[PDB]
Amino acid sequence: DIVMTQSPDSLAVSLGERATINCKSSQSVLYSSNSKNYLAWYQEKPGQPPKLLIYWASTRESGVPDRFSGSGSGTDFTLTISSLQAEDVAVYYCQQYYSTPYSFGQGTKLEIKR
Template identity: 60%
Template sequence: DSPLLLSAVGGNVSISCATSRGVNTYKKINHLLAWYQQKDGESPKLLIYYASTRESGIPSRFTGSGSNSDFTLTISEIQAEDAAVYYCQSFHFINSQRVFTQ
């Protein structure tokens, strides 16, 4: 089972993600880190890419941080609609092969 994090509305939550291979945080496609939100019955929604860049339309209370192999998604001022499963995904272009990890 996935770890469960609980917060009262208005609280803050931090979700950690550790990758087995280092990820560059600058805008280079070879290695990147993204965060997704998936609500019940819906497809995953991109929140953050390049570790800290918010997708268009994502509220500023969603913040990505970290570098190399350790990353964090912070949700500030939690709202009821933030109830979801959150995933981190790393992308690597290694030896001409695209590698995605969850």
């Protein structure tokens, strides 16, 4: 059973500043056979379903802005936004697709400090 835990639960930074959200999996999601991390990051904008941002722990999905980047390996991971944009207000989720059933973290609410 893999449980995903995020930290913090919510945070706020001024526009243009960096934001950092962490995620921890109960078990390792690094597959030894291919040395890849089965971890993903989702962005859930207000009233919208979560959409894929990063997969394989650090591979950015197409169309996704350059300011988003994932890092980490094993059990500790980090989603970083280099420079916060207004449209980034959302709840960010981390997911392990290492073993079924695929599980999500409980989300970290990102807001901008006005």
